[PDB]
Amino acid sequence: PYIGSKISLISKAEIRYEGILYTIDTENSTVALAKVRSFGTEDRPTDRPIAPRDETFEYIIFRGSDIKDLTVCEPPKPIM
Numbered sequence: 312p313y314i315g316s317k318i319s320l321i322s323k324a325e326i327r328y329e330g331i332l333y334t335i336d337t338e339n340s341t342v343a344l345a346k347v348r349s350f351g352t353e354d355r356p357t358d359r360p361i362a363p364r365d366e367t368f369e370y371i372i373f374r375g376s377d378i379k380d381l382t383v384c385e386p387p388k389p390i391m
Contacts, residue, residue, distance in 0.1 A: 313363045317350055317384045323377035330369075332383070340375030347371065 315331030320342060322328070330347025346367040353361060 312350070312361065314346060314365065316387050319380075319382045319384075320344070320347075320373070320378060321380040321382075322373060323379060325379050327380075336375070340378070342373045342375055342378065342381070344372065345370040 315333055317329065318332045319327055319329045328344075328347050329349055330344050331350070332342070333345040334343040335341070336343065346365060347369050348365075
């Protein structure tokens with residue numbers, strides 16, 4: 312559970328990924344992802360409810376201009 316803003320980003324190859332957004336460089340439109348992974352139940356339907364203990368290995372920064380689609384689920388700041 313928790314961590315960051317859950318979004319789905321589609322890269323230039325029209326490939327979708329779900330993760331938690333960490334930072335976005337508005338100048339180059341570059342998206343900084345960290346711990347991109349699905350969120351909710353492991354290989355088990357939570358036989359033991361999982362707490363936020365997760366580490367970042369799959370993280371990646373995208374060129375931004377190479378994004379096909381940015382769909383967000385939760386807006387951190389409604390007022391910018």
